[PDB]
Short mmCIF file of N, CA and C in Angstrom, two decimals:
data_model
loop_
_atom_site.label_atom_id
_atom_site.label_comp_id
_atom_site.label_asym_id
_atom_site.label_seq_id
_atom_site.Cartn_x
_atom_site.Cartn_y
_atom_site.Cartn_z
N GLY A 13 0.82 -1.33 -0.25
CA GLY A 13 -0.49 0.29 0.44
C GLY A 13 0.86 0.69 -0.23
N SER A 14 -0.15 2.42 0.29
CA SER A 14 1.17 3.56 0.14
C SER A 14 0.68 4.74 0.70
N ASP A 15 1.22 5.31 1.27
CA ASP A 15 0.69 6.92 2.14
C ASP A 15 1.26 8.02 1.48
N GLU A 16 0.47 9.10 1.35
CA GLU A 16 0.94 10.10 0.62
C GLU A 16 0.64 11.47 2.15
N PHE A 17 1.35 11.94 2.41
CA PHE A 17 1.40 13.32 3.84
C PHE A 17 2.37 14.53 3.37
N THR A 18 2.15 15.27 4.40
CA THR A 18 2.95 16.82 4.06
C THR A 18 4.47 16.77 4.89
N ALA A 19 5.42 17.53 4.76
CA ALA A 19 6.12 17.79 6.06
C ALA A 19 6.61 19.63 5.30
N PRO A 20 7.17 20.33 6.23
CA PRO A 20 7.86 21.46 6.23
C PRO A 20 8.99 21.41 4.72
N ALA A 21 8.71 22.30 4.50
CA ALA A 21 9.44 22.30 2.85
C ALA A 21 11.08 21.85 3.38
N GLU A 22 11.23 22.85 4.47
CA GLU A 22 13.06 23.09 4.89
C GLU A 22 13.12 21.92 5.80
N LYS A 23 12.43 20.40 5.87
CA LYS A 23 12.71 19.32 6.12
C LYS A 23 12.89 18.58 4.70
N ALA A 24 13.07 18.48 4.04
CA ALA A 24 13.53 18.00 2.57
C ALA A 24 14.78 17.43 2.79
N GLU A 25 15.77 17.96 3.37
CA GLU A 25 17.26 17.64 3.21
C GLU A 25 17.26 16.13 4.44
N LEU A 26 16.90 16.84 5.17
CA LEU A 26 16.74 15.46 6.43
C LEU A 26 15.92 14.29 5.47
N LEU A 27 14.91 14.56 5.23
CA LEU A 27 14.11 13.23 4.68
C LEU A 27 15.15 12.15 3.12
N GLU A 28 16.24 13.00 2.91
CA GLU A 28 16.60 13.06 1.79
C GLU A 28 17.89 12.01 2.43
N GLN A 29 18.24 12.47 3.12
CA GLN A 29 19.45 12.21 4.12
C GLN A 29 18.95 10.67 5.12
N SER A 30 17.74 10.76 5.13
CA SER A 30 17.17 9.73 6.57
C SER A 30 16.47 8.70 5.30
N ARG A 31 16.30 8.46 3.90
CA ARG A 31 15.66 7.51 3.55
C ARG A 31 16.07 6.47 4.11
N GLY A 32 16.95 5.69 3.70
CA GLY A 32 18.05 4.87 4.14
C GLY A 32 17.89 3.90 5.84
N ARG A 33 17.42 5.01 6.59
CA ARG A 33 17.23 5.11 7.72
C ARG A 33 15.91 4.40 8.21
N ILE A 34 14.98 5.15 7.78
CA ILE A 34 13.60 5.01 7.51
C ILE A 34 13.22 3.84 6.94
N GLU A 35 13.82 3.27 5.95
CA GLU A 35 13.54 2.34 5.08
C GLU A 35 14.40 0.75 6.34
N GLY A 36 15.26 1.07 6.45
CA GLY A 36 16.00 -0.02 7.70
C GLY A 36 15.14 0.17 9.04
N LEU A 37 14.54 0.79 9.16
CA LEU A 37 13.66 0.89 10.68
C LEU A 37 11.92 0.28 10.25
N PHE A 38 11.85 0.68 8.83
CA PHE A 38 10.27 0.61 9.30
C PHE A 38 10.20 -0.72 7.70
N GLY A 39 11.22 -0.69 6.98
CA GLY A 39 10.79 -1.69 6.12
C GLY A 39 10.21 -1.06 4.63
N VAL A 40 10.49 0.46 4.72
CA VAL A 40 9.64 0.96 4.05
C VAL A 40 10.03 1.87 2.82
N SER A 41 10.09 1.96 1.55
CA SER A 41 10.25 2.79 0.42
C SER A 41 9.78 4.60 0.90
N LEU A 42 10.62 5.41 0.67
CA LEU A 42 10.18 7.23 1.17
C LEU A 42 10.58 7.92 -0.17
N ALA A 43 9.50 8.67 -1.02
CA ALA A 43 9.86 9.46 -1.31
C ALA A 43 9.63 10.74 -1.35
N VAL A 44 10.51 12.71 -2.22
CA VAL A 44 9.44 13.11 -1.98
C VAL A 44 9.19 13.39 -3.19
N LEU A 45 7.67 14.06 -3.18
CA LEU A 45 7.24 14.14 -4.46
C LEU A 45 7.50 15.38 -5.08
N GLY A 46 7.34 16.01 -6.11
CA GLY A 46 7.36 17.16 -6.87
C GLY A 46 6.55 18.20 -6.53
N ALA A 47 6.56 19.20 -7.27
CA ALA A 47 5.58 20.06 -7.24
C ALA A 47 5.76 20.73 -8.74
N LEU A 48 4.46 20.48 -8.81
CA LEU A 48 4.16 21.00 -11.12
C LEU A 48 2.84 22.36 -10.46
N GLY A 49 3.34 22.57 -11.35
CA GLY A 49 2.33 24.10 -11.28
C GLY A 49 2.67 25.34 -11.57
N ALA A 50 3.92 25.22 -12.27
CA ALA A 50 4.31 26.60 -11.72
C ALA A 50 4.33 27.26 -10.68
N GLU A 51 3.37 27.43 -10.19
CA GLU A 51 3.36 28.47 -8.88
C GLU A 51 3.53 27.69 -7.81
N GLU A 52 4.82 27.65 -7.07
CA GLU A 52 4.86 27.42 -5.46
C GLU A 52 3.54 27.59 -4.20
N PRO A 53 3.21 26.42 -3.83
CA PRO A 53 2.19 27.00 -3.12
C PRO A 53 2.13 27.16 -1.23
N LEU A 54 1.27 28.23 -1.27
CA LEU A 54 1.04 28.54 -0.30
C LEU A 54 1.51 28.50 1.35
N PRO A 55 0.95 26.97 1.51
CA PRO A 55 1.93 26.70 2.52
C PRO A 55 3.46 26.31 2.62
N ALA A 56 3.88 26.18 2.01
CA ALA A 56 5.56 25.56 1.63
C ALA A 56 6.01 24.72 2.30
N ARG A 57 4.89 23.27 2.05
CA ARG A 57 5.07 22.04 2.50
C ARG A 57 5.59 20.99 1.15
N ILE A 58 6.59 20.21 1.22
CA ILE A 58 6.20 19.03 0.23
C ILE A 58 5.51 17.79 1.49
N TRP A 59 5.32 17.60 -0.45
CA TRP A 59 4.74 15.86 -0.44
C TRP A 59 5.33 14.54 -0.42
N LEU A 60 5.18 13.96 0.61
CA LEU A 60 5.98 12.35 0.92
C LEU A 60 5.07 11.28 0.64
N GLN A 61 5.84 10.29 0.04
CA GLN A 61 4.74 9.09 -0.46
C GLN A 61 6.00 7.84 -0.08
N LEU A 62 5.07 7.51 1.03
CA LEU A 62 4.97 5.95 1.50
C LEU A 62 4.94 4.71 1.28
N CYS A 63 5.53 3.73 0.94
CA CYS A 63 5.15 3.16 0.42
C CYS A 63 5.89 1.46 0.53
N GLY A 64 4.52 0.76 1.30
CA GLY A 64 4.90 -0.53 1.83
C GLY A 64 3.58 -1.35 2.56
N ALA A 65 4.03 -2.28 3.56
CA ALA A 65 3.14 -2.90 4.11
C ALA A 65 2.23 -1.63 4.85
N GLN A 66 0.94 -2.42 5.36
CA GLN A 66 0.01 -1.07 5.94
C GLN A 66 0.30 -0.57 7.09
N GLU A 67 0.65 -1.68 8.20
CA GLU A 67 0.90 -1.07 9.12
C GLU A 67 2.00 -0.76 8.88
N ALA A 68 3.55 -1.52 8.24
CA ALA A 68 4.99 -0.43 8.87
C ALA A 68 4.42 1.14 8.03
N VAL A 69 3.67 1.25 7.05
CA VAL A 69 4.23 2.47 6.12
C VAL A 69 3.68 3.47 7.30
N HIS A 70 2.70 3.14 7.99
CA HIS A 70 1.56 3.55 9.08
C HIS A 70 2.66 4.03 10.59
N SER A 71 3.48 3.22 10.79
CA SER A 71 4.58 3.37 11.81
C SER A 71 5.28 4.55 11.21
N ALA A 72 5.49 4.39 10.17
CA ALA A 72 7.21 4.80 9.43
C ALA A 72 6.48 6.57 9.86
N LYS A 73 5.19 6.47 8.74
CA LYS A 73 4.39 8.26 8.77
C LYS A 73 4.72 9.14 10.45
N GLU A 74 4.33 7.92 11.38
CA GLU A 74 4.30 8.31 12.71
C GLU A 74 5.54 8.94 13.35
N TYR A 75 6.36 8.44 12.39
CA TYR A 75 7.93 8.48 12.84
C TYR A 75 8.49 9.94 12.20
N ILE A 76 8.26 9.52 11.06
CA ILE A 76 8.63 10.90 9.98
C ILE A 76 7.63 12.06 9.99
N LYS A 77 7.03 11.72 10.84
CA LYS A 77 5.95 13.47 11.38
C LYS A 77 6.80 13.77 13.06
N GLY A 78 6.81 12.17 12.86
CA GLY A 78 7.27 13.19 14.90
C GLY A 78 8.30 13.64 14.62
N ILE A 79 9.72 13.47 13.71
CA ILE A 79 10.96 14.30 13.91
C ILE A 79 11.22 15.42 12.88
N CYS A 80 9.92 15.32 12.30
CA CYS A 80 10.05 16.94 11.84
C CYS A 80 9.20 17.62 12.46
N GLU A 81 8.01 17.29 12.44
CA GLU A 81 7.08 18.11 13.52
C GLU A 81 6.83 17.81 14.97
N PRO A 82 7.59 17.44 15.41
CA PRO A 82 7.74 16.80 17.08
C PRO A 82 6.62 17.56 17.74
N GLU A 83 5.62 16.48 18.57
CA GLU A 83 4.19 17.56 19.21
C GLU A 83 4.70 17.62 20.97
N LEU A 84 6.20 16.63 21.17
CA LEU A 84 6.06 16.27 22.32
C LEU A 84 8.12 16.45 22.76
N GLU A 85 8.60 16.31 23.56
CA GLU A 85 9.79 16.69 23.98
C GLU A 85 10.48 16.15 25.62
N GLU A 86 10.17 14.98 25.43
CA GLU A 86 10.86 15.04 26.77
C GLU A 86 11.93 14.47 27.58
N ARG A 87 12.16 14.07 28.72
CA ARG A 87 13.48 13.19 28.87
C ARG A 87 12.83 11.90 30.09
N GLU A 88 13.19 11.24 29.59
CA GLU A 88 13.66 9.73 31.01
C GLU A 88 14.33 9.01 31.66
N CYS A 89 14.99 9.46 32.84
CA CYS A 89 15.55 9.53 33.73
C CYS A 89 15.35 7.47 34.23
N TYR A 90 16.64 6.73 33.79
CA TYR A 90 16.65 5.54 34.99
C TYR A 90 17.53 5.16 35.62
N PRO A 91 17.60 4.33 36.52
CA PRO A 91 19.39 4.03 37.06
C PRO A 91 20.22 3.22 36.45
N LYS A 92 21.49 4.26 36.42
CA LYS A 92 22.94 3.86 35.98
C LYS A 92 23.01 2.45 35.53
N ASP A 93 22.36 1.29 36.00
CA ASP A 93 22.73 -0.05 35.13
C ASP A 93 21.87 -0.87 34.32
N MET A 94 20.87 0.08 34.43
CA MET A 94 20.12 -0.67 33.32
C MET A 94 20.45 0.39 32.23
N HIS A 95 21.43 1.01 31.87
CA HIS A 95 22.39 1.50 30.75
C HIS A 95 22.54 0.94 29.92
N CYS A 96 22.80 -0.39 29.42
CA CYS A 96 23.05 -1.81 28.62
C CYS A 96 22.21 -1.53 28.06
N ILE A 97 20.73 -1.63 28.41
CA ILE A 97 19.26 -1.92 27.41
C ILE A 97 19.26 -0.77 26.46
N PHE A 98 20.06 0.46 26.44
CA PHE A 98 19.87 1.90 25.80
C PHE A 98 21.03 1.29 24.90
N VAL A 99 21.89 0.96 25.48
CA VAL A 99 23.72 0.55 25.04
C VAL A 99 23.73 -0.52 23.64
N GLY A 100 23.46 -1.21 25.05
CA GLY A 100 23.99 -2.49 24.72
C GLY A 100 23.55 -3.71 23.33
N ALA A 101 24.23 -4.26 23.08
CA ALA A 101 23.65 -5.40 22.04
C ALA A 101 23.49 -4.77 20.49
N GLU A 102 24.36 -3.83 20.52
CA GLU A 102 24.73 -3.07 19.16
C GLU A 102 23.35 -2.20 19.46
N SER A 103 23.08 -1.84 19.95
CA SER A 103 21.09 -0.46 19.95
C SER A 103 20.71 -1.19 19.22
N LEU A 104 20.61 -2.44 19.72
CA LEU A 104 18.92 -3.60 19.00
C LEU A 104 18.42 -3.15 19.93
N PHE A 105 17.93 -3.68 20.99
CA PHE A 105 16.88 -2.51 22.49
C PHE A 105 16.46 -1.49 21.75
N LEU A 106 17.84 -0.60 21.76
CA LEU A 106 16.79 0.70 21.34
C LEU A 106 16.38 0.69 20.05
N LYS A 107 16.71 -0.18 18.89
CA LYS A 107 15.75 -0.01 17.85
C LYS A 107 14.80 -0.32 18.05
N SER A 108 14.50 -1.30 18.53
CA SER A 108 12.70 -2.56 18.83
C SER A 108 11.76 -1.52 19.65
N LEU A 109 12.70 -0.14 20.21
CA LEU A 109 11.39 0.72 20.81
C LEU A 109 10.74 1.37 20.16
N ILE A 110 12.88 2.02 19.45
CA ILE A 110 11.91 3.05 18.63
C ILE A 110 11.19 2.66 17.02
N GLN A 111 11.13 1.86 16.43
CA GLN A 111 10.36 0.73 15.61
C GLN A 111 9.22 0.07 16.73
N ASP A 112 8.88 -0.29 17.78
CA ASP A 112 7.94 -0.07 18.69
C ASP A 112 7.33 1.24 18.33
N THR A 113 7.56 1.99 19.04
CA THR A 113 6.94 3.21 19.43
C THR A 113 6.41 4.49 19.19
N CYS A 114 7.31 4.74 17.79
CA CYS A 114 7.83 5.39 16.38
C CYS A 114 7.95 6.85 17.09
N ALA A 115 8.64 6.43 18.34
CA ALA A 115 9.01 7.49 18.55
C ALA A 115 10.48 7.75 18.84
N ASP A 116 11.08 9.18 18.69
CA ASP A 116 12.24 9.41 18.17
C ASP A 116 13.58 9.21 19.33
N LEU A 117 14.13 8.05 19.61
CA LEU A 117 14.99 8.24 21.20
C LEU A 117 16.36 8.44 21.19
N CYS A 118 16.82 9.65 21.94
CA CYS A 118 18.08 9.91 21.96
C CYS A 118 19.05 8.84 23.32
N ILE A 119 20.27 8.94 23.96
CA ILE A 119 21.43 8.34 25.04
C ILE A 119 21.37 10.07 24.67
N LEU A 120 21.54 10.84 25.86
CA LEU A 120 21.75 12.06 26.39
C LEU A 120 23.15 11.73 27.23
N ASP A 121 22.95 10.46 28.55
CA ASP A 121 23.89 10.86 29.24
C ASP A 121 23.89 9.18 29.50
N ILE A 122 24.51 8.72 30.51
CA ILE A 122 24.42 7.24 31.32
C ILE A 122 23.03 7.72 32.36
N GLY A 123 21.50 7.42 32.65
CA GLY A 123 20.67 7.53 32.74
C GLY A 123 19.83 8.34 32.49
N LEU A 124 19.57 8.93 31.19
CA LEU A 124 19.31 9.78 30.25
C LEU A 124 18.84 9.84 29.20
N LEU A 125 17.47 9.14 28.74
CA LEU A 125 17.02 9.49 27.41
C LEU A 125 16.59 10.49 26.84
N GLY A 126 16.91 11.42 26.22
CA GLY A 126 15.47 12.14 24.93
C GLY A 126 14.58 11.18 24.38
N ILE A 127 13.29 11.96 24.32
CA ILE A 127 12.60 11.05 23.55
C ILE A 127 11.48 11.82 22.41
N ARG A 128 11.34 11.97 21.60
CA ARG A 128 10.98 13.77 20.80
C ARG A 128 9.95 12.79 19.42
N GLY A 129 8.72 13.37 19.28
CA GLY A 129 7.81 12.79 18.52
C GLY A 129 6.85 12.99 18.43
N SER A 130 5.61 12.44 17.82
CA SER A 130 4.26 12.30 18.31
C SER A 130 3.94 12.58 19.64
N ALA A 131 2.83 13.27 19.64
CA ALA A 131 2.72 13.07 21.49
C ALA A 131 2.47 11.87 22.11
N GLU A 132 1.58 11.17 21.02
CA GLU A 132 1.75 9.47 21.68
C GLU A 132 2.88 8.91 21.44
N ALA A 133 3.33 9.00 20.85
CA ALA A 133 4.44 8.48 20.70
C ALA A 133 5.27 8.35 21.47
N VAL A 134 5.85 9.78 21.72
CA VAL A 134 6.67 9.56 23.59
C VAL A 134 5.87 9.75 24.77
N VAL A 135 4.30 9.84 24.51
CA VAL A 135 3.31 8.88 25.96
C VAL A 135 4.16 7.65 25.87
N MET A 136 3.66 7.38 25.01
CA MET A 136 3.86 5.32 24.24
C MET A 136 5.40 5.19 25.28
N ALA A 137 6.20 5.62 24.79
CA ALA A 137 7.54 4.99 24.94
C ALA A 137 7.78 5.60 26.42
N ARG A 138 7.81 6.59 26.77
CA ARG A 138 8.38 7.07 28.21
C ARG A 138 7.36 5.68 28.95
N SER A 139 6.04 5.64 29.12
CA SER A 139 5.11 4.46 29.53
C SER A 139 6.04 3.44 29.19
N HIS A 140 6.33 2.98 28.49
CA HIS A 140 7.19 1.75 28.28
C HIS A 140 8.14 1.16 28.78
N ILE A 141 9.54 2.40 28.97
CA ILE A 141 10.41 2.92 29.85
C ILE A 141 10.18 2.81 31.32
N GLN A 142 9.38 3.62 31.72
CA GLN A 142 8.99 3.37 33.03
C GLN A 142 8.95 2.28 33.37
N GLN A 143 7.84 1.56 33.13
CA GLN A 143 7.89 0.06 33.08
C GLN A 143 9.05 -1.23 33.23
N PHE A 144 10.24 -0.58 31.97
CA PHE A 144 11.15 -1.34 32.43
C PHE A 144 12.15 -1.22 33.96
N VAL A 145 12.19 0.11 33.89
CA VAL A 145 12.39 0.80 35.45
C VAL A 145 11.90 -0.22 36.23
N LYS A 146 10.41 -0.10 36.26
CA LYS A 146 9.47 -1.06 37.79
C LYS A 146 10.45 -2.30 37.72
N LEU A 147 10.30 -3.09 36.12
CA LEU A 147 10.55 -4.55 36.51
C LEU A 147 11.85 -4.35 37.24
N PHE A 148 12.61 -3.78 37.16
CA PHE A 148 14.76 -3.34 36.93
C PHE A 148 14.64 -3.11 39.06
N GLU A 149 13.83 -2.68 39.01
CA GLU A 149 14.01 -2.06 40.45
C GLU A 149 13.46 -3.27 41.69
N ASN A 150 12.18 -3.44 41.61
CA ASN A 150 11.42 -4.38 42.51
C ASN A 150 12.14 -5.89 41.95
N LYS A 151 13.51 -6.41 42.15
CA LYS A 151 14.08 -7.60 41.91
C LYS A 151 14.10 -8.10 43.33
N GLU A 152 14.32 -9.58 43.61
CA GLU A 152 14.67 -9.69 44.95
C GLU A 152 14.86 -11.97 44.44
N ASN A 153 15.17 -12.37 45.25
CA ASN A 153 15.70 -14.29 44.97
C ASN A 153 14.08 -14.45 44.72
N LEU A 154 14.28 -15.13 43.30
CA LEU A 154 12.89 -15.91 43.15
C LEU A 154 12.75 -17.16 43.21
N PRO A 155 11.44 -17.91 43.17
CA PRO A 155 11.48 -19.12 42.68
C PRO A 155 11.92 -19.51 41.13
N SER A 156 12.80 -20.77 41.28
CA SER A 156 13.46 -21.31 40.11
C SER A 156 12.50 -22.15 38.62
N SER A 157 12.08 -21.89 38.03
CA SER A 157 11.46 -23.14 36.98
C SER A 157 11.94 -23.11 36.01
N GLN A 158 11.30 -24.02 34.76
CA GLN A 158 11.88 -24.21 33.76
C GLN A 158 12.14 -22.76 32.65
N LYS A 159 10.68 -22.61 33.33
CA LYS A 159 10.59 -21.50 31.79
C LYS A 159 11.28 -20.10 32.28
N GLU A 160 11.77 -19.78 33.84
CA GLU A 160 13.15 -19.11 33.57
C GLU A 160 13.60 -19.67 33.08
N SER A 161 14.56 -20.76 32.94
CA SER A 161 15.94 -21.07 32.39
C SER A 161 16.01 -21.07 30.64
N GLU A 162 14.52 -21.18 30.34
CA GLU A 162 14.16 -20.92 28.91
C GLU A 162 14.57 -19.31 28.38
N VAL A 163 13.89 -18.89 29.31
CA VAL A 163 14.25 -17.10 29.32
C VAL A 163 15.48 -16.76 29.34
N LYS A 164 16.44 -17.30 29.92
CA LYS A 164 17.48 -16.89 30.57
C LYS A 164 18.42 -17.56 29.56
N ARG A 165 18.40 -18.57 28.71
CA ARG A 165 18.72 -19.09 27.76
C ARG A 165 19.08 -18.30 25.84
N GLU A 166 17.71 -18.16 25.94
CA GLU A 166 16.92 -17.43 24.83
C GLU A 166 17.56 -15.42 24.33
N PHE A 167 17.61 -15.11 25.46
CA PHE A 167 17.93 -13.96 25.99
C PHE A 167 19.76 -14.08 25.87
N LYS A 168 20.31 -14.64 26.83
CA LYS A 168 21.77 -15.27 26.49
C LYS A 168 22.77 -15.31 25.14
N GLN A 169 21.48 -16.22 24.21
CA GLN A 169 21.99 -16.14 23.04
C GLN A 169 22.07 -14.97 22.02
N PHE A 170 20.56 -14.56 22.30
CA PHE A 170 21.07 -13.34 21.45
C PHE A 170 21.60 -12.17 22.30
N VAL A 171 21.99 -11.67 22.76
CA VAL A 171 22.82 -10.84 24.07
C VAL A 171 24.46 -11.37 23.81
N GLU A 172 24.78 -12.69 23.19
CA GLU A 172 25.79 -13.65 23.64
C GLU A 172 26.41 -12.89 21.37
N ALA A 173 25.15 -13.18 20.75
CA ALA A 173 25.53 -12.85 19.22
C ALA A 173 25.74 -11.18 19.41
N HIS A 174 25.51 -10.39 19.93
CA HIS A 174 25.94 -9.02 19.98
C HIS A 174 26.67 -8.60 20.48
N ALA A 175 28.10 -9.52 21.14
CA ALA A 175 28.18 -9.38 22.16
C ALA A 175 29.42 -7.75 22.41
N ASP A 176 29.14 -7.50 23.66
CA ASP A 176 30.34 -6.19 23.80
C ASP A 176 30.11 -5.90 25.75
N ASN A 177 31.25 -4.42 25.56
CA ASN A 177 31.00 -4.38 26.96
C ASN A 177 30.23 -4.22 27.62
N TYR A 178 28.69 -4.87 27.47
CA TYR A 178 27.46 -4.28 28.46
C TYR A 178 26.80 -5.63 28.36
N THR A 179 27.71 -6.62 27.86
CA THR A 179 26.58 -7.63 27.38
C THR A 179 26.98 -8.48 29.04
N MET A 180 27.81 -8.38 30.07
CA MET A 180 27.26 -9.01 31.11
C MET A 180 27.01 -8.19 31.96
N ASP A 181 26.81 -6.98 32.52
CA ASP A 181 25.40 -5.88 32.57
C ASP A 181 24.16 -6.42 31.91
N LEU A 182 23.84 -7.18 30.85
CA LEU A 182 22.36 -7.11 30.50
C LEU A 182 22.06 -8.17 30.88
N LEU A 183 23.35 -9.35 31.68
CA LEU A 183 23.29 -11.08 31.73
C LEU A 183 22.46 -10.87 33.29
N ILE A 184 22.80 -10.31 33.96
CA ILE A 184 22.49 -9.67 35.51
C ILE A 184 21.26 -9.32 35.64
N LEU A 185 20.43 -8.56 33.95
CA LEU A 185 18.97 -7.99 34.60
C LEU A 185 17.97 -9.17 35.08
N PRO A 186 17.40 -8.63 35.82
CA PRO A 186 16.02 -9.40 36.42
C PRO A 186 15.64 -10.65 35.00
N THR A 187 14.89 -11.61 35.20
CA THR A 187 14.76 -12.15 34.46
C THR A 187 13.09 -12.10 33.63
N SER A 188 12.57 -11.00 34.96
CA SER A 188 11.26 -10.43 33.82
C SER A 188 11.80 -9.43 33.05
N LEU A 189 12.80 -8.62 33.39
CA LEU A 189 13.06 -7.47 32.36
C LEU A 189 13.24 -8.50 30.66
N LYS A 190 14.44 -9.13 30.92
CA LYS A 190 14.95 -10.13 30.08
C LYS A 190 14.13 -10.66 28.87
N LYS A 191 12.56 -11.01 29.84
CA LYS A 191 11.30 -11.62 28.80
C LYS A 191 10.30 -10.19 27.78
N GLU A 192 10.62 -9.21 29.17
CA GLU A 192 10.59 -8.24 28.21
C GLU A 192 10.70 -7.92 26.41
N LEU A 193 11.90 -7.52 27.32
CA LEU A 193 13.27 -7.28 25.98
C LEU A 193 12.96 -8.10 24.79
N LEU A 194 12.91 -9.18 25.10
CA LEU A 194 12.53 -10.24 24.11
C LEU A 194 11.34 -10.25 23.17
N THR A 195 10.28 -9.87 24.19
CA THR A 195 9.75 -9.88 23.31
C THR A 195 9.43 -8.82 22.69
N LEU A 196 9.80 -7.62 22.84
CA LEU A 196 10.35 -6.01 22.29
C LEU A 196 10.89 -6.20 20.96
N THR A 197 12.18 -7.61 21.36
CA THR A 197 13.18 -7.66 19.38
C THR A 197 12.24 -8.41 18.87
N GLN A 198 11.77 -9.54 19.36
CA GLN A 198 11.35 -10.73 18.31
C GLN A 198 9.10 -10.40 18.13
N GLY A 199 9.08 -9.31 18.61
CA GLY A 199 8.15 -8.18 18.14
C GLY A 199 8.22 -7.18 16.48
N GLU A 200 9.66 -7.73 16.38
CA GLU A 200 10.30 -6.20 15.18
C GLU A 200 11.06 -6.94 14.32
#
């Protein structure tokens, strides 16, 4: 399918530069359309055409609108030991979160994320991160189970496939958080 919408003309260079990224994130194709009829139109906006699967195009449109004309820009604080989630595993958890929420997520400092885009994308992203933090914080010694071992094994295989300086920090995350992180990446 395809969707046509506008962006401020000034964002032409941004969108041209970001085509690759946007396709890589959402699996869509992005083109900037012409402006015919001799005369420049009043709003000075450029038309974009997105092509691909329906929900993929919907997500990408929301992201593109978010980075061109964000409705919200917010911060999110998180515990320092959770930082591995956002910079570890070759940034794949952060990438999945961007794909899932359609918010633009930026690592500002250890323990600090910047979140921008459409209001609903930003609201969703913040809610998801606060939820990760909740799982991370109330962690205590808990029951052993086969189900726990399968999640730990699956999580370890994923992170070991993308090994870096954060691998050990990721491996000591609570199993509940590991499960939500797997859900997040496998859903994308």
